[PDB]
Design a protein around this ligand. Sequence first.
Ligand code: HEM
Ligand SMILES: Nc1cccc(N)n1
Length: 289
Amino acid sequence: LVHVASVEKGRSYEDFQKVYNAIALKLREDDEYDNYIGYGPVLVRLAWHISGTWDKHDNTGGSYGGTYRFKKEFNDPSNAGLQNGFKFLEPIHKEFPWISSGDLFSLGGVTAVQEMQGPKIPWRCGRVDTPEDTTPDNGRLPDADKDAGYVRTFFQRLNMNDREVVALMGAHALGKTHLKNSGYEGGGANNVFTNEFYLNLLNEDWKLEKNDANNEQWDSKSGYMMLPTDYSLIQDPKYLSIVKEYANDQDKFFKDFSKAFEKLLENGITFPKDAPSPFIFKTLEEQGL
Ligand code: HEM
Ligand SMILES: Nc1cccc(N)n1
């Protein structure tokens, strides 16, 4: 299965910057969401979940086809709550109806990371909507009540190695868990992208508790939480080393997250040798907007 990137006809960097800016301005405007977290974190999670269906073995799933728009995938229990991100993006899509769905969902995550003061994430256009029959079945996204060996095996399907896994999970500095979505509750409610995930893992005093859904999670007295799969990153000695690295080097974390997150968003896509180079969007702040 080959998915060849095809640039939306006649579009260039300055078209996609406009879309980025519309997303970014709406992120600033719609600030009340989720007790004043705003939509940044949910957009990052949307971009990940639309990408994380990918299977390297047969090139099924992935961001290219925009298949989250279809009910089988929209309704995946693993995607509960992401409808809020889709609803955020609907006026953006109405303004810019020429962008493909996969391009919009992936660009929403890039825009969110950058506007939350995270790294620059180079981004490539040309995902093409594919039909409803190409929608992957539910069950391809990961469970949270598992251990490091589970996490490591899971991510091999996505062609991610230990460093890439640990870097990607730093996104768990953002937003929160919600009991009614996933059966986990709590988190920093943070809407600034930092390396805090790693510092919290190493620094807090964690206790293994049960939540009101009868699931185990790690809680800190400071009011933070970790999923079992997050905590596994300090139980496994290989992950632990990388957690320490990122807890001690903000810039390295930023660079490695950027590389892994673009990768994630590009898995499954064949870019022609003459395709445009990746775009690096300016933030609103860099534009004086
Ligand atoms: C083993 C891998 C992972 C597991 C098991 C996992 C699981 C979860 C769960 C259970 C939630 C809470 C959802 C809710 O209740 O609303 C969540 C939230 C979140 N996840 Fe992950 N995740 C994983 C990897 C990732 C990766 C790779 C990223 C992106 C790079 C990511 C980004 C997010 C973000 C940003 C949120 C917060 C959403 C919000 O505040 O609404 N996750 N994740
Ligand atoms: N904010 C957040 C989201 C997912 C998992 C964790 N540990 N925390």
